[model samples]
Target chain A: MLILTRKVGESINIGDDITITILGVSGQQVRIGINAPKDVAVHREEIYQRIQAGLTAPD
Target chain B: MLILTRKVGESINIGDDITITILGVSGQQVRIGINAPKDVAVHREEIYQRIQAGLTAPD
Candidate 1:
């Protein structure tokens, strides 16, 4: 796990393609932003867990 | 992990609503079908990785 520390408005790039930015915060949850190609996919953690657990896909 | 064995055209329900079905097979990959609620989210694994790795959110 390559953990790169960041602050609000700070960001990092990956493979020269994707970029992750720290937008702001809401209570303890940090608001984030993402920039990537159209071919890429993005989703939240809870959603991922559900999918992995065999939750039905939405129509 | 609770593994439910299913065959083509077979399905299993989660809670009271969601259903996962094995649609068919494509080469070595099995095509799947899901029936879920609209509020639920669904995404592929690769995209989820980018988000987890702090990839920049698109503008």
Candidate 2:
């Protein structure tokens, strides 16, 4: 794992396409913003798993 | 899996407080907006696992 220190508003560039920005930090929570190609699927871990498993059905 | 159809401005209520909204839909991609408690940690599937593994170090 590559470790780097960045402050709010700073960004980490991925390859030549993606960029992750540190939006905010408060207490134990940090808000992040990502800039990636539209073709890339980005989702919350919990939701992503469900989406991949075809579990979008509501209970 | 609970399955339901929602429009661009529609949303699904989770329990009492959480709300998941369909922000936009384009091609095979859908943008979702989530409203949850502050204590809840929401993260992308890949990033969530990485965070859980204590692998915050960037390469």
Candidate 3:
């Protein structure tokens, strides 16, 4: 069920707070931000993190 | 799938064009090293990036 983040835009609807907010900028470090088991949850979180950070680096 | 046991400092080759090296071992997290075309790649590049950068914080 949580593996849906791969869809990118589908699971992001409000699911960010539930699925990703768990990995939110809690400490600004996505490392321990979620600590939610690392079972692809934070993996996807950090993916978007890099997707954003990498995407934003040029912006 | 990405099975566990891919400990730190290990590496795997993706055919003849890609190489994924274990770049981080942040205790609770593991990072990878990837280098490939920007068109369709990753899943490891950021791991190395964060691995080196993560070395900075050493948290």
Candidate 4:
């Protein structure tokens, strides 16, 4: 895995487009701001899993 | 889990606020639309997992 070290207020660029910024770190949770195109999909794991599970179930 | 049956253009309400709608279904992919407050965090499983991993890693 490619690991890039970034401090608060710092950011890393993915290719020429996407940029991920370290917004803040409070306790165990880290807040990040992602700058990406609207066409990209971004979602939380638990929520995405719930949606995926819903899709797979017999209707 | 609450299993609610909804056709395309139909939606299910959660509590008095959140509403999840069935937009479209194409092959294995199901398109859904969620209506919720900005405070709620919504993300895909893989991206969320990656963020979590980044947060937990020893720095």
**lDDT per residue, candidate 4, A1-59, as tens digits?**
12233455654434333444545444333444556564443344334456556563244
Worst 10 residues of 3 chain A by lDDT: A7-16
Worst 10 residues of 2 chain B by lDDT: B1-10
Worst 10 residues of 1 chain B by lDDT: B1-10
lDDT of 4: 0.45
Worst 10 residues of 2 chain A by lDDT: A1-10
Pairs in clash, predicted candidate 4: A43-B43, A43-B44, A44-B43, A44-B44
- All candidates: TM-score of chain A: 0.72, 0.75, 0.20, 0.70
Error of 1 at B31 (Å): 39
Candidate 3: regions farther than 4 A off = A1-59, B2-4, B43-59
Model 1: CA > 4 A from native: A52-59, B1-59
In terms of TM-score, which candidate is strongest? 2
Candidate 3 whole-model C-alpha lDDT, 0 to 1: 0.30
Candidate 2 global lDDT: 0.48
- Candidate 4: Cα lDDT at B1: 17
RMSD, each candidate, Å? 17.8, 14.6, 17.1, 17.9
Candidate 4 chain A weakest ten by summed lDDT: A1-10
| Tens digit of per-residue lDDT, candidate 2, span A1-59 | 22334454555444334445555544333445666565455454445556667655478
Number of clashing pairs, model 2? 8
Q: What docking grade does candidate 1 earn?
A: incorrect
